[PDB]
Symmetry: D2
Subunit: 334 residues, 4 copies
Amino acid sequence: VKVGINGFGRIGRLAFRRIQNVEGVEVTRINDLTDPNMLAHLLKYDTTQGRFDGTVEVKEGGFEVNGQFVKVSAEREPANIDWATDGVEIVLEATGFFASKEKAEQHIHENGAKKVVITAPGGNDVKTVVFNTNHDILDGTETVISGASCTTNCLAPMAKALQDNFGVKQGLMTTIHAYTGDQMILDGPHRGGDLRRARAGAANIVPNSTGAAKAIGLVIPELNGKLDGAAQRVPVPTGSVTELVATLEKDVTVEEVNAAMKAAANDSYGYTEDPIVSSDIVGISHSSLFDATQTKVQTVDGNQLVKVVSWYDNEMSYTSQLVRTLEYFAKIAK
Amino acid sequence: VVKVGINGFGRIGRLAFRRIQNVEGVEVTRINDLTDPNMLAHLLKYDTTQGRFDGTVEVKEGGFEVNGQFVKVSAEREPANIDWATDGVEIVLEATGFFASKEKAEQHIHENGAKKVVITAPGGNDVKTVVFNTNHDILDGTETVISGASCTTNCLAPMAKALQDNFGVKQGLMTTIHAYTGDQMILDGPHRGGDLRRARAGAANIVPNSTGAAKAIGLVIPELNGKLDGAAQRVPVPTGSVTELVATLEKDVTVEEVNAAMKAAANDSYGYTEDPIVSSDIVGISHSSLFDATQTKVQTVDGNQLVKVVSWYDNEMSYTSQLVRTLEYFAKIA
Amino acid sequence: VKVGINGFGRIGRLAFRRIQNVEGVEVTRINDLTDPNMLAHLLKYDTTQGRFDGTVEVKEGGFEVNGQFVKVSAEREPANIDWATDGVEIVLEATGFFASKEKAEQHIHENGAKKVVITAPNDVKTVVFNTNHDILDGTETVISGASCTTNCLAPMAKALQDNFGVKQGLMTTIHAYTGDQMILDGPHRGGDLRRARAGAANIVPNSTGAAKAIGLVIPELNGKLDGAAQRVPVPTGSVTELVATLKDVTVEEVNAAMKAAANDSYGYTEDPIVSSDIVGISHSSLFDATQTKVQTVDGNQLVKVVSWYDNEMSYTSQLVRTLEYFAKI
Amino acid sequence: KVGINGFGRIGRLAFRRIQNVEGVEVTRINDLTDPNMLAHLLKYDTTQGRFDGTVEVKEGGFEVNGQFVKVSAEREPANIDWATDGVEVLEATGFFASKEKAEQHVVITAPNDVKTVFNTNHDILDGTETVISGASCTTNCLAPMAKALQDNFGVKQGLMTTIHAYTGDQMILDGPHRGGDLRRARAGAANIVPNSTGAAKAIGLVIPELNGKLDGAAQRVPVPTGSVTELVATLEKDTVEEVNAAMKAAANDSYGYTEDPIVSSDIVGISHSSLFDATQTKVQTVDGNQLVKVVSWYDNEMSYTSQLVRTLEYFAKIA
Ligand SMILES: NC(=O)c1ccc[n+]([C@@H]2O[C@H](COP(=O)([O-])OP(=O)(O)OC[C@H]3O[C@@H](n4cnc5c(N)ncnc54)[C@H](O)[C@@H]3O)[C@@H](O)[C@H]2O)c1
Ligand SMILES: NC(=O)c1ccc[n+]([C@@H]2O[C@H](COP(=O)([O-])OP(=O)(O)OC[C@H]3O[C@@H](n4cnc5c(N)ncnc54)[C@H](O)[C@@H]3O)[C@@H](O)[C@H]2O)c1
Ligand SMILES: NC(=O)c1ccc[n+]([C@@H]2O[C@H](COP(=O)([O-])OP(=O)(O)OC[C@H]3O[C@@H](n4cnc5c(N)ncnc54)[C@H](O)[C@@H]3O)[C@@H](O)[C@H]2O)c1
Ligand SMILES: NC(=O)c1ccc[n+]([C@@H]2O[C@H](COP(=O)([O-])OP(=O)(O)OC[C@H]3O[C@@H](n4cnc5c(N)ncnc54)[C@H](O)[C@@H]3O)[C@@H](O)[C@H]2O)c1
Ligand SMILES: [Mg+2]
Ligand SMILES: [Mg+2]
Ligand SMILES: [Mg+2]
Ligand SMILES: [Mg+2]
């Protein structure tokens, strides 16, 4: 299956990197808003994720990656990308500006692509897939799908384990997040109207909103309407952590919650009892990584509050799932 | 006019000195650290996070002058061997962070010593801990050793007490997103305290850590003894922190009633704001805590409620403002 | 004199702050690309420079600052700003997009302003205050307050010339990161493969014209200096090193010479300060005696002199001084 | 075998490299803390990444891919019984960087009295020396760049400026510096901080023909690792292209070459001692007189450590 990337940014470029070690999926075209020399440089060198494991050499209208040429273009409007020229069936929409069924669908047309995977929430009329949590829902007939938020991919397997063992009454999330491209490097007008993302992202603790908690219902229906949360963006260029304080149906101890998470561990959901820090989870392939050292169960007058926390690298952790769901989606084509 | 001595001319020590200049009834006449006067004079005049000193500091022999008035300096490691009486100092600010107990702080009190001591940190349960404008009434003036509590307790106290005196709290879990501090390593190296996370580079990591402030709230507000607990997330900002508290309350509430309740409880120590500020905005403030209405949450799921309240504090200056207020009040009733 | 600001950014907002404590010049309109609520918030709160010393409350089409409504607009083209409506004679061009004779002149029009001062870099007089402020007569439509680095380098280099004379020199400025860098690795619209990189997590080399275009300020050094930059992770505050061949000198004569040249713009210090210490200062440049070097090897000499400056406030202080002087004449 | 005194940044990274070298093998570590602390700091590394292996803590040590390594906590090196594990020592504490105190058992991982850069003056060693030094991080960078300038064009005099990452000897926040330095007292990760550097003047001990001709200072900046060295010099000869070409010729395993516009993060964890950057080369000719500027990257941690291990390997060979 031949794939195209619209938006060769952080998620776009890292997705490309992971596609190299996945047989049966292959990127043959990239579309951004800049010349090929810029994109080749940004693939080779990466501040947070390290230099590229390969060779990248710039050509005309593209660059070669270990010998295979990949065409690049600078088409701003998705309608005008001739995806069909390079046989691209599926497009990774990673611009962050066409994160809806309506605007993503402008990739699908004559001389266009068949299907689209948005690298972000895509609205409620689009299927939202956290791999190894609800990828079963996919049948292969969907024109537009979404890989969810970075925070949802983290929160899902941790919350799902709580439900399938103890059941959850309600919960409040707090994610301590790395700063991202949508923040200003220094104090300046934010085009999105946010008075906090306007502030210097790398020199401040800056609060902000996140839909991941409320829109969990679309991934795990049994938790619909039960959660809500906010974010605190802090000065690290990548790597985040999600805290969840919840009330559970049953009564629990610290050891049963940790043990329950260990059982639920897989390729996406990790487990650790080492006292790691944010830099330790940079570039990991797990979507989320439960940290047993931070588990709390506070019993006061029979009532219990449970706190569970899990790490995730917003960049690579999410990208790992986006690629897994892309691989699975490409196979059941149709 | 009560004359004071500083043991430990560090972050809290130096800032305390700065604030004591604009308080008439108290005046510092001696400083004791582990270095020459030229080092301490430089660190008073120039301050990365808090700005240059508002005055003139010139180095003399065995001290330095501040706006004319000479202050003696010494380099005595043992508190027992400081001749505090030579400079008439009745009260000592213990800001080394090594003598934070009744027993070890008491080594300031002796012949050729001081009369009383204020520890700039938790000092144990056999020592009264004072959060100013929350429980300073408890003091009578006869106490040899007292404590100004933690930076986080001074923040959490007025926010939690307001919740109790309006709605009552069943239980609560705290999360503080804290600035990095001197007890962390600048880069990955052996921590003398045995902490495998404070061993890590403090300014390049989200680093989880423990905090007693939440549980030891009982010593400040007895009606909340044993009801709270929490953890910390140290993040790369050199000063400025924020405290989140998720709690279950006796009454039912709305967002507006909790904000309004905090506004009522506001004073010189407990601030209030509805502006969407960030961490740098609270650097060098005089309020102990500053409630942020924009971050308030009240989540109703199936009749049950969870309440989230958040407040800023500058671990350095916010705490120091209370430490000085408690010092002023204590000096008067001696 | 009534003034307007086009581009309420770092330099724009700080200029506004300093204009409050100068009587006889006064801002009556701001033009940017966003609503008034955004600009009011960014004036009140400032990460690097501290909270505003005043009161700001948002109204319609503007905000009040200690009283007196100040209009705000979101006009993209300079041609289409009706500056005359609010009586603004002079405009601060701080967008960083109209730094030329032709494009700055689109402020000067029938519905518009009389004159313009661009907040950056030859058809235009380039003025570093207390270094070549003489040059203005008051009849110039467009002028420029030079770069942040030029305002720093000028008084340090001029002192070297007026005492010892300069053969040639190479500059290295260790600069704070700025808004033209990417917060994270992404395509730079300007095509720079280094400002494309995460500005706050890298030492990033970059070019700087300030060194060569010294001739425009002080003709006596024209063509003899050149330099580059190293952008480093601090949100504001920079330092300029200059290694030069000059008479023969000692360390003490160079320091003493700089102290003599000190004034309101050119500072002097012998304290071992660091970048955070110079944040928000009013001096354009601040010579640091502790870093002076004079290396004599086989009769030949190399001289190294270093001076701090806060790209933001240091420069802004001069821009406002030049604006004040220009408004009078 | 080798033993490590000071399992810090340079100590631990040296250990890491020692795994991918046959004929050298570390069997003892001595620091000032328990084995559990050192095992954690080997497994996890903020700047250099997680350890490529398996680490499990035991009694008085920890196992690395099955083989136990002893650990001890002796402050005075005289009383470390190195002979117990057959060690024929990397002095990486930074407190015993002298003939007298290092001799008290050696390769010092830092700077007259002792031999001082692999592939630049490795010939000097014969194998009979009790005390030798791997030089500074900055010298290992500057040496192959300066040596190339001499062996092609010859240099009159030069002034160095190194933009350096912050290091463990700086304070995390403003506080009294043990060493009395009023600038390393300041918050290392929130400031441009000027500092002194011997590397430039003490180049004579590595390249004698340059003795007394160079000098420089440092600017410490907020990055946890990765540095760059600028050198402005006047040469004996009278273009940009010949200097770049000359460096390319001098390139080897230690001295790298690049014409890509990289930044500090790109050189983190590299094995080259120095990496010449052609994009930053300048030659300014004004009135017949010339000034030449040449710049080269180095990761103070791993770049230096790569040489320290290479010189350790070579030194072990000719014992
Ligand atoms: N960065 C993260 O941590 C993270 C995590 C989860 C998902 N995401 C999502 O991934 C997407 C990309 O985020 P990112 O961090 O990579 O952002 P980014 O800014 O790094 O990526 C944007 C890229 O798209 C390009 N672009 C912009 N407008 C375009 C247009 N009209 N047509 C084509 N290309 C255009 C940009 O030049 C750049 O190459 C967003 O939807 C974001 O929400 C990001
Ligand atoms: N930093 C904060 O935000 C904060 C907030 C509240 C409480 N505190 C408490 O304040 C105290 C000081 O913390 P800090 O951040 O100012 O630390 P710091 O490390 O900046 O201050 C310590 C100072 O004490 C000196 N010192 C060490 N041992 C000494 C001794 N035996 N005799 C004399 N001086 C000695 C050090 O040299 C240094 O000058 C600690 O108890 C800390 O827990 C700090
Ligand atoms: N940044 C510094 O420290 C510094 C130092 C020297 C000189 N300068 C120069 O000053 C200028 C301003 O740069 P800055 O650092 O303030 O950047 P900035 O990002 O703060 O300025 C950008 C501002 O201009 C506004 N803007 C953009 N396009 C506009 C348009 N068409 N119409 C109206 N407003 C528009 C933006 O919304 C924003 O408010 C640049 O030329 C810069 O080189 C600044
Ligand atoms: N990393 C660099 O930038 C760099 C550059 C070149 C060489 N070096 C040199 O290497 C040496 C180590 O520096 P580092 O960066 O690894 O520092 P570090 O602080 O990370 O390493 C110090 C280690 O030695 C231990 N130690 C201290 N005193 C000891 C004693 N008396 N006995 C035993 N162990 C003791 C410490 O606890 C710690 O484990 C210094 O001389 C330094 O100048 C480092
Ligand atoms: Mg492939
Ligand atoms: Mg006083
Ligand atoms: Mg005015
Ligand atoms: Mg080996």
